[PDB]
Structure 1
């Protein structure tokens, strides 16, 4: 995994990419296509491009480069944001409050029953099934953080 600090280094480095996204995008696809010519074969738009000079002159290659780095930036920002909520809760619950992972299942069951009780209009058998799965996914993600911090279970 990455620490708090490492995710912030990644987002700071991505700040630099985003500052010249056109140039960064072009150079990434030129590097990909010159380093690994086989990757060209996936692209109807580009598979006939032979040289770095031909690639630097391609307006469509520059546009596609921007699209790739924009999408990757969005995915890394959302990954980092999830980790940023997750890690502090795992860290406090595992190292300070000393909560075993199994207790997260008990509070998950309690949250489901209180939602059902208080909001039955908003929370049917479908919503309850979906919420049960969502809280299991949450527990799996905290459990992964627990493992990194030296707790299994």
Structure 2
């Protein structure tokens, strides 16, 4: 897992996100959808968004960004002791939403990109290393639940 020092870096970085949860959430989803248009097709409520302008202007997209990052933040604050929080998310994403694990890799990469974009020069090598590890742990625990379900 992550060391105590690594968790402290993760949660320090997360303070930056919490100062503007909707803004970070919106940018993460826009990075995901523009980089990987197939992902948009999993959202019946966003498939009408035909341009980035329309995405940027969507209050509902910002709302979902808030829901996503709030869930992720609750998970990160558990510092790996996240079974109860993570199991239901993994199961809804496999069974209801049909989200392949590759798309979770995509959104993980989008989070790292958005952190650099919004905090250039303020997201250092140690911070990126710790946040990467945290997102890998998140993805890996979801993947174990996916394997249990035989999903993908």
**Structure 2 length-normalised TM:** 0.52
Q: Measured at CA, do residues 9 and 20 of structure 1 come closer, stay the same or move farther in structure 2, by a change above 3 Å?
A: same
Q: Which structure has more RCO (C-alpha within 8 Å, separation ≥ 6)? A: 2
The answer to whether residue 136 in structure 2 is matched with residue 136 in structure 1 is: yes
Q: Which has the larger radius of gyration?
A: 1
Aligned-pair distance for 1:120?
A: 60
Aligned-pair distance for 1:115?
A: 48
Aligned-pair distance for 1:129?
A: 40
Q: Measured at CA, do residues 42 and 12 of structure 1 come closer, stay the same or move farther in structure 2, by a change above 3 Å?
A: same
- The whole-number CA distance in structure 2 between the counterparts of 1:99 and 1:54 is 23
**Structure 1 length-normalised TM:** 0.52
Higher helix share: 1
- The whole-number CA distance in structure 1 between the counterparts of 2:24 and 2:14 is 11
Give the aligned CA root-mean-square deviation in angstroms.
20.9
CA contact (8 A) 1:112 1:128 kept: yes
Aligned-pair distance for 1:79?
A: 3.0
Structure 1 unaligned spans of 5+: none
- The whole-number CA distance in structure 2 between the counterparts of 1:150 and 1:106 is 21
